[PDB]
A paper describes a structure:
To produce protein complexes useful for cryo-EM analysis, we designed a large tetrameric protein complex. The crystal structure of YgjG shows that it forms a homotetramer, with each monomeric subunit containing 460 amino acids. The protein A-ZpA963 heterodimer was chosen as the linker connecting YgjG and the target protein. ZpA963 is a variant of protein A that non-covalently binds to protein A with high affinity. As a test case, we used a calmodulin domain with molecular weight of ~10 kDa as the target protein. For protein assembly, the N-terminal helix of the protein A domain was connected to the C-terminal helix of YgjG by superimposing ten amino acids. The crystal structure and a binding assay using gel-filtration chromatography revealed that the complex forms a rigid hetero-octameric complex, as intended.
Here, we propose a method for generating proteins and protein complexes with complicated shapes using fusions of alpha helices. To design amino acid sequences that can stabilize the alpha helical structure of the fusion sites, we superimposed one or two turns of terminal alpha helices of connecting proteins using a molecular graphics program. Then, the amino acid residues important for forming a fused helical structure were chosen from the two natural sequences in the superimposed region. Our method does not require complicated computer calculations for the design process and can be used for the assembly of artificial protein complexes with predictable and rigid structures.
Numbering used by the authors:
A (entry chain A), B (entry chain B): 7 to 501
C (entry chain F): 107 to 218
Amino acid sequence: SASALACSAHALNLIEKRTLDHEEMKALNREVIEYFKEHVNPGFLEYRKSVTAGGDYGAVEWQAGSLNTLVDTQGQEFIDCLGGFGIFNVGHRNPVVVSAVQNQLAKQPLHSQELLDPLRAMLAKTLAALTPGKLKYSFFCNSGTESVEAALKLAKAYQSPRGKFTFIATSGAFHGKSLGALSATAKSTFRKPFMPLLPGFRHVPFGNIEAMRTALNECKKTGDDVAAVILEPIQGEGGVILPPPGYLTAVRKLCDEFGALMILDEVQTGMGRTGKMFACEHENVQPDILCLAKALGGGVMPIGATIATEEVFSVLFDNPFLHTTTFGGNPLACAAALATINVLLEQNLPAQAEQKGDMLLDGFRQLAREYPDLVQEARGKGMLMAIEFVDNEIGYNFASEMFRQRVLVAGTLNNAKTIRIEPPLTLTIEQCELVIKAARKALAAMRQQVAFYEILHLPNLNEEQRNAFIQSLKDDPSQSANLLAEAKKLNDAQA
Amino acid sequence: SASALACSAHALNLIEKRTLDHEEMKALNREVIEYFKEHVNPGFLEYRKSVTAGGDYGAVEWQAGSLNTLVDTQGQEFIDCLGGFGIFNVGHRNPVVVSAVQNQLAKQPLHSQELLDPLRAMLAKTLAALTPGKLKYSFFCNSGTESVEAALKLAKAYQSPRGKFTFIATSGAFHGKSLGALSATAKSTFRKPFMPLLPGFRHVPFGNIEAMRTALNECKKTGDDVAAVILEPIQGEGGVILPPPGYLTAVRKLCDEFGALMILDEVQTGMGRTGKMFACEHENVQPDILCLAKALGGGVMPIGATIATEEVFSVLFDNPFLHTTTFGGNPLACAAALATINVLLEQNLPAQAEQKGDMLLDGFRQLAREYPDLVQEARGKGMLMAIEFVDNEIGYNFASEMFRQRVLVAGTLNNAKTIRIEPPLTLTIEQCELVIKAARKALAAMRQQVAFYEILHLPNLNEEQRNAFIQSLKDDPSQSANLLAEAKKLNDAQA
Amino acid sequence: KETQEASWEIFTLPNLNGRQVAAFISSLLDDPSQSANLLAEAKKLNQIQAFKEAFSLFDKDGDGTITTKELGTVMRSLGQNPTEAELQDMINEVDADGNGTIDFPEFLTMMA
Ligand SMILES: [Ca+2]
Ligand SMILES: [Ca+2]
């Protein structure tokens, strides 16, 4: 058809463009839909259809608008309440992060892998200064799942000479999709097609200290002593699930008691999202191993970090090549990360995340009491929030209605009824009120919608008074509640 | 020591600097050695000590010099014959790749993960055009090990409903260090501390078609039918091991016969290094799954890609979230990759790699016959070469002596006697001659050294008869190999 | 193992000939214990030899002593313009024997 050279050349021509005319846009959207269908995954097209209405399923990314907005190929601007599921904590194209990445790009993007690269040392020192307690040594990779892999391998190298092999995770947990991390991840549909996974992985209910104590004690009784416990401080993909106060402290004490390592997965909750730099700081809990990614890249670079105490990390001192990764700790990613830490500390973005989080969650809870027919509950901590609906169809219509009002939201991998709100920490107060209002109009449209369907499906109604009923439903929406009652008032009287 | 804010600020000040005075340089080198010792890994410091002489163990990266040179914090320029173990196929800071990355950085670095990003579609289409046969669908991640993880998960999702679970790899293979990929990787020291790994992984000798046929037939007889065979077309970390002609074709035929999938790991051999775009093109072999990374990033970005036929990749169509990764397919990485494919095709860098590879390997083979006391053999294909020495200490002294002459080389993870030569495909002929001469002076110095030791351990000669020999060796270092001859010519007569 | 590393580090010193490196090698084979100290004074010895060389090239007429004009020649050559009094002060500061010229050690003392 065309050669790879032609395709690449076209792609670079399109990378160099800053805006698109209407016919260039139509051709590009048509192209991207085709190539998604034939070379990426057609399932994605169906998914976005299930969270949109009409051609909304075919919005194509183009450029960052401001710190908190994204602009598609048609110039439509969206407020980003998705934040790349926790990536854009410091907004899109943060000037400081973009600046650092450009400077280091001017010097050297990737390292030789042989000589000492200075930004890896600088970032390791910074992270040692920034992490609680004895967390001292850092290993750098490129993703969250890789960080969890490094955590598991550290735990294994430390505990295998001590006769401990089994790992305890929690139900509803998500720790990545690489096979190692996938053994810890808990969602059935993510795991079943790839079994068998790693042996000796067990799961207990999240937030239930007695269940976990039971698991450790039974594992000790049967000779399957636990090497490590891994958990998120707050389950992001589980639907923003908050553990009871003191749970993390009790888990730390339990691991200390049984001689198991505590691995905290802060891939999503880290870098200021929950109101503090790390969620474990809410209870002043120091794990043995801490996992970071996503937001640590500043929304510019991919990066992951596994920080551990010298006691545990020392298992790699005799053989520094025991665990490595091809691109880990490259100068570009390190520059991004240092820039992000600087931005978060200088603008005190964690505290801002607490304030704006409290405000948005207040709004969402008020909407929750006003719409109990659609919203089950709203929950969150800092700027990691979620709204759980009555069914999945309802939350679907919510995501769609918010997308039509140009506010970006998305579901949670382990919870089909829940929609997450994870906007940048730089979201302004004006945009906070705009998002609350958008949620209100969404819920209103959804209530009028369910009324419209219920009125449409009544079987004991001829066509004329149905046309009158939906006609009135359109012309006076605030009477929605009454007319629906009236509809059934008549649907019963001729049964 | 200091607060995280201070550390970050210092790091950004150092990122913005373009040159260093010597007190700046000395302070920075001292800093990076300290932070490597206390926050990264002290073992690395010891390793570089074993491959250097004096303060050469403490060379710190600073900036790319030219396409094929690296400049440390002291202004010393090195010819890069390491290429990041296959990363810098198109050189350091390739203007085209840097340009594309800069433009897309101006537009948007990371995607929302919800809307359609166009460069993912463009890159998937380009890779479909560039890959042999029915390879059609691409999954994008951030590293080689992640690409291998995606390959394994594709094979599992395809073969588990067909009752096949076991995987066959080869000894001496390297496929990554994440637990999934590590189950396929073959080096004992990399695997033992993290066992148990994935069940049902077996290894056969590389290049031995009858051994592999035996493994498949026995697995079928016992009901442990093989889901997939995974191998590198040429083993990189094994010491650049070349299979017999027709091996890849026979492996494809065998997989077709038993109904197993063929997974080709081209993380190292891909992107033109072996004289063609992919090593599998030497025999016109199309695998079911192809793994790419390293060089696909153009030496600017981290990226990985798993390409598969629609037949196998279709296992992700019903549920597009069955396998994902946080940063995979981000616009920066895609821009880098497209720029790299463009550069490779427009400058026909594969063919250049064949020519320059033939030249360098000719030089190395001539040095090999001139120095059989130190070199066992030199091997290679395209610009993926290696020199295997008699001992590990010998190859160590070679790496050190080449580093002293400001030519970068490094060892191979699975082969302690072998030093790899993996320079950029953009290496100039002048630099080819320079590296050949550097290798010559290295081997000369090493012969002088081994002679100097061997003269010291000869038993049958008096305490002063040696000192004449050492003396003559040092102030008149010309009688060298022939001198060692004299030494033994007296030792065996005095026996 | 370390006796060998010592043996090669002493062997590779640029400013020693075979006779002394060989003598030292003897001292090290007889004593693996007196290494890093023997190694230390050997390294130092290299420093003295190279210092000797440079000094020799600072004695233009090769007569083994350095005068104010030879000094002067080097000082003027390095872009400077010393006066007679400055040169005399420099020599006077280290002139242990008061003969007005610089011998071998006194030059080492100037450097110290
Ligand atoms: Ca004189
Ligand atoms: Ca005197």
